[PDB]
Each structure stands twice: as structure tokens, then as C-alpha cells.
């Protein structure tokens, strides 16, 4: 019935979403060959949410994998769960962008957006009923930020009453990975404050700190990093694939969170994340998961909530629990921490449960937070853009192949509008 079309753009999306299909194939008991091997029928009624029917017990995911180069697409075909994808959904160009938004949005993207749009509309037209879209990308480069924004803008004018979610990665404070990161990020956010419904903010160094301190992992692989994002992104959409005592789907989680049509930049979290040696020393109950849900280290964005306020929070619990203790736990959290929640919203907390937690744990919860302390990340991107743009840094690779500086000025003013609105809403 309800059905989500998935998209993976750029290297970041093509790895993280691939790990997402890795982590939800085992939730529905599906082998790499795609033959169903589940032990309970209960994991089979809502396969059609993310997968597609094929004969003989084969199930095939829907995913239009797109990047301007084929190398990172052939890396994911070599993986453990790689052959599940349909090969005609693979769309790839000839030459890469070069970590520039201009080439990913105007030069090469305009010669490839038609085919990926056609495959996207082929998957969407074969839908029993359409609910929304899914996109994994980052805000640093050109093949994940110049193509994802173009795809979202092209999708919005065809299906304007549905909800598109971009699962984005934001630049890091201490150390950058691309020199032209602010230039990509400001132009990407200019195309994301207007089109999509709600995005997620993932920082790399926040996850680095999580696996160094909280998880106590000496050598964190990139699979160790992407598994966190996979778990916290599979926990949100669990209310439409399994029953629950209070089910709350994606559009349910859309009305509850965003109060004003521009303030929809989110912050996720995962409750049970314990070290190897601390399993016996920690009891597993609902309050001992609320201690980690609202933990400032467990936030996957690099803003501390204590420098701002929350508008609304969400907590998709999963598993064996009644919800007197769930609701009274959130009641206690809103009571003791009273000054950090906004006064003009009486009840600041959204809760929802299901009785199928993720694969390999007993109880879990996925924190979602719309904090007003996220303005500092946008502030950082703003003065990095100002510092580079005030006397013509690396601009001629953008200016020389399609746009002038008026677009940059308009995008910078659009970015600076958002922080002023956040400030005017912070102090009531």
C-alpha cells in the first residue's frame, strides 16, 4: 500500500543507502539472492513498502542509484548484498563533477537528469499508492549536492502533495574534507529550504566522537560509521512496516515537528549504543534509554542543545514496553528540563512505539530533535562563505561555467535570513 521511492546520489549516498539496504534486508529476512527465508510470517505483510515483487520468492528493492561516475556504483555491486538492485535502475554518466556544485547542477547534470527522472517516474507510476520519496546525499560535493538538489527540484513540480526527505550530511567544524565545502553547502541549502519537506543533519566528527567515546571503538571503519546512520534512518520508517501500539508514519511525523514552513532541519539519535564490556553492567529499561536519547553526546549533529532551545522533539520507541512509563518518562524530562523547552508550546514531546525493534537488540528508540541551537552550524557556514567570498576565492571554476555572483549573493542572503528567523523565534 504505502510506498517510498528511494534515491542515492553521490558517493556518500551510494555508500550510506547501500548500507541501509544491507541493514533492512536482514530485518525482512532476505538473502543476498533475494529469496525470502524469514522464520515468521509477521515480517512479510509490508514488504511492498521498500521492495518489489519478483517470481519464486525473489524480492527486489526500488533504488535509482545515480552518480556522474561509475566507480562508486561498481563498488556497491561488489558488496555482500549487491545483486538485489535492478541493473536498469543504475544511471551513471561519463566524467565526474570535481567536487563543484556548478558542474553537478548545470553542465553534466542537465544531460543526465532526464533519464534518472524517467526511471524515477517509472518506479512511481507502478505504485499502488504513493506516500513520498527518500534521498541519501551530502552537502559537500558536486555529484551528491549538485545532483540531489536538481533531482529534488525536478521531483517537487511533479508530485507536490507528497513528502520528500533528504538524508543529508553537513560540514564539520574542526576539519573539512573539501576546500570548496561552504560554497557547495550554501547553494545546497538554498535549494533545500524551499523544496523538500524535512531533512536530517549528520556531521562526520559527531559520529567520530560517538564511536570513539560512547561505543569505545579503537578502529572505526566506515561501515561502523554508516551503520549508525542506517539504524537511525530505519527507525523512523518502522511505523509503516510493522504493527505498533501507537503507529505514527512519515506524514504523522511531518505535521508534529515543523511549526513554520522553513524550520525543518532535524537532528537524529539512537538510544541503545553501549560498549562491548558494559553490557552486563547496564540494565535495559525505558528510563535507561531516555538517559541516552536526550544525551548531548548521542546527538549526531555537532551542536550542543544547551546553547539553544527545542521547539518539538520526537522519540520513535521500539519494543516491549507499556506507555505509562514512556509517557511519564517524557513528562519527567519536560518537567526537570523546563527552561530549555519553549514556553509558547505547552507539550513539546512526540512519542510513538512499535513492537518490532531493530535486528539484534531488545529495545530501541530513535530520537529526532528540532532544536534552535542548529543555527550555529548555519552561522559557521555563513561566515566561512563570507571569508572566502569577500575577496574572490575559488570562484572561477563556478563563474567560468554557468553562473555569476548574483546567485551567490542571493543564496547567502537566503542563508542569513534563516539564522535571523531562528534568533527571533528563540527568545519568544
Amino acid at each position: 500500500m504505502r510506498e517510498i521511492v528511494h534515491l542515492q546520489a553521490g558517493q556518500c549516498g551510494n555508500q550510506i543507502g547501500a548500507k541501509f539496504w544491507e541493514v533492512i534486508s536482514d530485518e525482512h529476512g532476505i538473502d543476498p539472492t533475494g529469496t525470502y527465508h524469514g522464520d515468521s510470517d509477521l515480517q512479510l505483510e509490508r514488504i511492498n513498502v521498500y521492495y518489489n515483487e519478483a517470481t519464486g520468492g525473489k524480492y527486489v528493492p526500488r533504488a535509482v542509484l545515480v552518480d556522474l561516475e561509475p566507480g562508486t556504483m561498481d563498488s556497491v555491486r561488489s558488496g555482500p548484498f549487491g545483486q538485489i538492485f535492478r541493473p536498469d535502475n543504475f544511471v551513471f554518466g561519463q566524467s565526474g563533477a570535481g567536487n563543484n556544485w556548478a558542474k553537478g547542477h548545470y553542465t553534466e547534470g542537465a544531460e543526465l537528469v532526464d533519464s534518472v527522472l524517467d526511471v524515477v517516474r517509472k518506479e512511481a507510476e507502478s505504485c499502488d499508492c504513493l506516500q513520498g520519496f527518500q534521498l541519501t546525499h551530502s552537502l559537500g560535493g558536486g555529484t551528491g549536492s549538485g545532483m540531489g538538489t536538481l533531482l529534488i527540484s525536478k521531483i517537487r513540480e511533479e508530485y507536490p502533495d507528497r513528502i520528500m526527505n533528504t538524508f543529508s550530511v553537513v560540514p564539520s567544524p574542526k576539519v573539512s574534507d573539501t576546500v570548496v565545502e561552504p560554497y557547495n553547502a550554501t547553494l545546497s541549502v538554498h535549494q533545500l529550504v524551499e523544496n523538500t519537506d524535512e531533512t536530517y543533519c549528520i556531521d562526520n566528527e559527531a559520529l567520530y566522537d560517538i564511536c570513539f567515546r560512547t561505543l569505545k571503538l579503537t578502529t572505526p571503519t566506515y561501515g561502523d560509521l554508516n551503520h549508525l546512520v542506517s539504524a537511525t534512518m530505519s527507525g523512523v520508517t518502522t511505523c509503516l512496516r510493522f504493527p505498533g501500539q501507537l503507529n505514527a508514519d512519515l506524514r504523522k511525523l511531518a505535521v508534529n515537528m515543523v511549526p513554520f514552513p522553513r524550520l525543518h532541519f532535524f537532528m537524529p539519535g539512537f538510544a541503545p549504543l553501549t560498549s562491548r564490556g558494559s553490557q552486563q553492567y547496564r540494565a535495559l529499561t525505558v528510563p535507561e534509554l531516555t538517559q541516552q536519547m536526550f544525551d548531548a553526546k548521542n546527538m549526531m549533529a555537532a551542536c550542543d542543545p544547551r546553547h539553544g532551545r527545542y521547539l518539538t522533539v520526537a522519540a520513535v520507541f521500539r519494543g516491549r514496553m507499556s506507555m505509562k512509563e514512556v509517557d511519564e518518562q517524557m513528562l519527567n524530562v519536560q518537567n526537570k528540563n523546563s527552561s530549555y523547552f519553549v514556553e509558547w508550546i505547552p507539550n513539546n514531546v512526540k512519542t510513538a512505539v512499535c513492537d518490532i525493534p531493530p535486528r539484534g537488540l531488545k529495545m530501541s528508540a530513535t530520537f529526532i530533535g528540532n532544536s534552535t541551537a542548529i543555527q550555529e552550524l548555519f552561522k559557521r557556514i555563513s561566515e566561512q562563505f563570507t571569508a572566502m567570498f569577500r575577496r574572490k576565492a575559488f570562484l572561477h571554476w563556478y563563474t567560468g561555467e554557468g553562473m555569476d555572483e548574483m546567485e551567490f549573493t542571493e543564496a547567502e542572503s537566503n542563508m542569513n535570513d534563516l539564522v535571523s528567523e531562528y534568533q527571533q523565534y528563540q527568545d519568544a
Binding site: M73, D74, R77, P87, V91, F92, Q94, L112
Partner: protein, 87 residues
């Protein structure tokens, strides 16, 4: 190596252009005479002599990239017909 130039300079240049010399400079001289000779001297070019069996310490598994069937078809298309534009 005598049979291919016959102590003649012209025959030597013809056998160089056509590639017909039968001796590599590893069997005759037990030291690199020319300096440019030392970039090949360790390599035994007999038939299939490998640096893995002889000197078994430089072995290193390759984390190579596997080109997919889709990309193999795309390469074959763009090589053969220029008028074909798949995707």
C-alpha cells in the same frame, strides 16, 4: 643475438624497429652496464617468471576495482558506436 644484426648497423636498426632481437640484457652480463638497464635487471623475462615465487616477500592482496556488467556494456557501446547514447 648475433643472428638478427649480423654485425651490421643497418640490420641492427631494422631489427630494433621490427622487434626481433632474441636476447634481453640479463643473461649476457652479470651487472647492469648501462644505467638505464637497472630498471629491468631484477625482472626475469623467461616465459612467465613472477616476482611472487622467486622472492616471496612482496606479496600483497589487491583491493582492485571490479567493473560492473553495466559499465562493461557502456564501455563497449561508447567504443564501438559513437551514435549510441545509453542513459
Amino acid at each position: 643475438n648475433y643472428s638478427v644484426h649480423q654485425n651490421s648497423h643497418t640490420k641492427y636498426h631494422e631489427a630494433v624497429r621490427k622487434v626481433s632481437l632474441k636476447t634481453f640484457p640479463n643473461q649476457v652480463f652479470r651487472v647492469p652496464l648501462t644505467d638505464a638497464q637497472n630498471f629491468s635487471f631484477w625482472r626475469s623475462n623467461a616465459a612467465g617468471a613472477r616476482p611472487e615465487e622467486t622472492m616471496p616477500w612482496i606479496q600483497n592482496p589487491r583491493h582492485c576495482l571490479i567493473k560492473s556488467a553495466m559499465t562493461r556494456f557502456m564501455d563497449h557501446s561508447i567504443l564501438n558506436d559513437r551514435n549510441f547514447s545509453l542513459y
